[PDB]
Design a binder for this molecule. Structure first.
Ligand SMILES: OC[C@H]1O[C@@H](O[C@@H]2[C@@H](O)[C@H](O[C@@H]3[C@@H](O)[C@H](O[C@@H]4[C@@H](O)[C@H](O[C@@H]5[C@@H](O)[C@H](O[C@@H]6[C@@H](O)[C@H](O)O[C@H](CO)[C@H]6O)O[C@H](CO)[C@H]5O)O[C@H](CO)[C@H]4O)O[C@H](CO)[C@H]3O)O[C@H](CO)[C@H]2O)[C@H](O)[C@@H](O)[C@@H]1O
Length: 467
């Protein structure tokens, strides 16, 4: 009813962003949930029954009774908190026009963000704009119409300040617009998407970090390259097993760091050996590409060298699908949970990078090649390519742009969605030579099985996907 209470409610609508990595008794880190269905990582852990839903999804054999349910609950918690704010604003007095617009812009952009999670993973899902199963195509029209309404409020700044980093901005809204327009293959909005990407490119407060290896460091958080991140902190963080929803750190580096690594060696710490980096991922980089070592941390070579320098035979404990490589971007780094005050496992400081300026450039290059209008697709592609330390210029073909995204975004939740929307999934996601993936992707796998408990509780109102 008052301004101060709506302000607190707006803050609460942001909280589900930082939940899925540990919430509702599951690990569903949203970047890995898509990346394990692509061609860059294995699943790992103790065996195929450790986080079993992950191994089933990876092999296109998810089942409604053994599914990732946490992310579903996170997304719909988000939607509910945004809906709360729209309803509260109906019953509010002495809120300025500007503050009313600002509160609406934030919670409607977040609502589309949360719906994007369930739209991409499950497609045909229930919709509510106040506290009905839509087709994927019907949810899309709701989402993109909401984003149009947020842009037209004309209230969001292009970039936030030190104090407010993590708040919705116009650039975040633009990147979210491009993500859903491109996943839908809605070419009637390609022109508008390209105009929005060019507005970010024209801004002098977004640019590439000159060193790719500086992006994923703590000092790289909210750099000139960052459009949107989900904030995680170790500073007096008290996220715990029984209190997963409190704003502290992330579980992600504990999941994907080497099992019984000797903490502090090469300033890396131990984890549970999930998402080992495939050897093929390391091999697809040129020796000149700075992304190779920023993506692929060779844990085994570090100990091989150490055991020749100081011959204590150090080892880590190899788990399932071990390769010797781990995802350096979100690896446990000595000191990145040092200031936490609860369980150190859940309180890593690593922000989750959602949108980076390199995705602005590759979005623009791709929209130009898909007929969105004139622009310098070759300049935009080659800015990303050259930042990686490659000196030879490449043409802005769709295949070169899609492969640049592949090199640029391992572990960032982009590749699986890129493979489906470009029509490459059926050709790329086939049985491997290791006997790990034994199934082939097909269009029926586009949308996961809806969790059985949701099918049951809805008593026929929710129709199961034919996965
Ligand atoms: O498949 C994935 C993977 O799973 C592994 O299993 C996981 C399993 O290890 C985990 O087990 C829990 C375990 O970590 C936990 O241990 C407690 C620890 O949490 C406790 O820490 C306390 C904090 O609780 C406390 O926090 C306080 C905070 O709650 C309060 O609100 O605020 C206070 C400040 O204001 C704050 O203090 O803070 C103190 C420090 O002051 C901490 O010490 O400490 C004890 C050690 O003393 C430790 O034993 O116990 C839990 C009991 O519930 C266990 O559940 O659980 C996961 C989820 O179920 C499992 O995934 C497997 O091992 C791997 O093989 C798999 O690969």
């Amino acid at each position: 009813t008052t301004d101060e209470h709506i302000q607190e409610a707006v803050v609460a609508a942001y909280d589900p962003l930082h939940w899925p990595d540990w919430a509702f008794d599951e690990y569903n880190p949203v970047n890995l949930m898509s990346d394990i269905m692509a061609d860059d990582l294995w699943v790992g852990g103790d065996s195929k029954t450790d986080n079993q839903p992950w191994h089933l999804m990876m092999n296109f054999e998810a089942i409604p009774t053994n599914m990732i349910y946490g992310l579903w609950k996170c997304a719909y918690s988000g939607v509910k908190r945004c809906n709360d704010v729209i309803t509260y604003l109906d019953w509010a007095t002495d809120v300025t026009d500007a503050n009313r617009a600002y509160y609406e812009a934030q919670v409607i952009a977040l609502r589309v963000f949360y719906y994007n999670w369930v739209w991409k993973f499950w497609g045909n899902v229930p919709y509510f704009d106040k506290n009905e199963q839509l087709t994927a195509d019907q949810l899309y029209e709701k989402m993109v119409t909401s984003l149009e309404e947020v842009i037209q409020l004309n209230v969001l700044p292009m970039r936030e300040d030190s104090e407010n980093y993590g708040r919705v901005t116009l650039a975040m809204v633009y990147m979210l617009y491009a993500e859903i327009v491109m996943y839908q293959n809605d070419d009637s909005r390609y022109s508008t998407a390209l105009k929005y990407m060019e507005e970010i490119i024209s801004s002098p407060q977004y640019d590439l970090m000159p060193d790719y290896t500086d992006i994923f460091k703590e000092t790289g958080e909210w750099s000139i390259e960052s459009i949107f991140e989900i904030n995680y902190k170790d500073d007096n963080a008290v996220r715990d097993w029984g209190s997963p929803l409190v704003a502290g750190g992330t579980a992600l580096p504990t999941l994907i760091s080497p099992y019984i690594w000797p903490n502090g060696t090469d300033n890396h710490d131990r984890g549970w050996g999930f998402c080992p980096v495939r050897k093929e991922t390391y091999e697809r980089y040129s020796n000149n590409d700075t992304r190779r070592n920023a993506t692929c941390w060779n844990a085994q070579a570090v100990l091989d060298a150490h055991n020749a320098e100081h011959p204590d035979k150090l080892s880590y404990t190899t788990r399932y699908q071990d390769t010797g490589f781990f995802l350096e971007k979100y690896a446990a780094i000595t000191g990145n949970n040092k200031d936490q005050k609860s369980s150190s496992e859940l309180n890593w400081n690593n922000n989750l990078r959602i949108y980076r300026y390199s995705e602005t450039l590759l979005n623009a290059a791709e929209l130009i090649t898909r007929g969105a209008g004139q622009g310098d697709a070759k300049k935009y592609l080659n800015l990303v390519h050259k930042r990686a330390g490659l000196v030879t210029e490449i043409e802005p073909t769709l295949d070169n742009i899609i492969e640049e995204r592949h090199l640029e975004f391992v572990g960032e939740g982009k590749r699986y969605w890129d493979l489906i929307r470009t029509g490459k999934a059926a050709s790329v996601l086939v049985p491997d030579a290791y006997g790990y993936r034994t199934n082939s992707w097909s269009s029926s796998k586009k949308y996961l099985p809806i969790p059985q408990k949701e099918i049951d509780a809805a008593k026929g109102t929710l129709v199961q996907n034919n996965y």
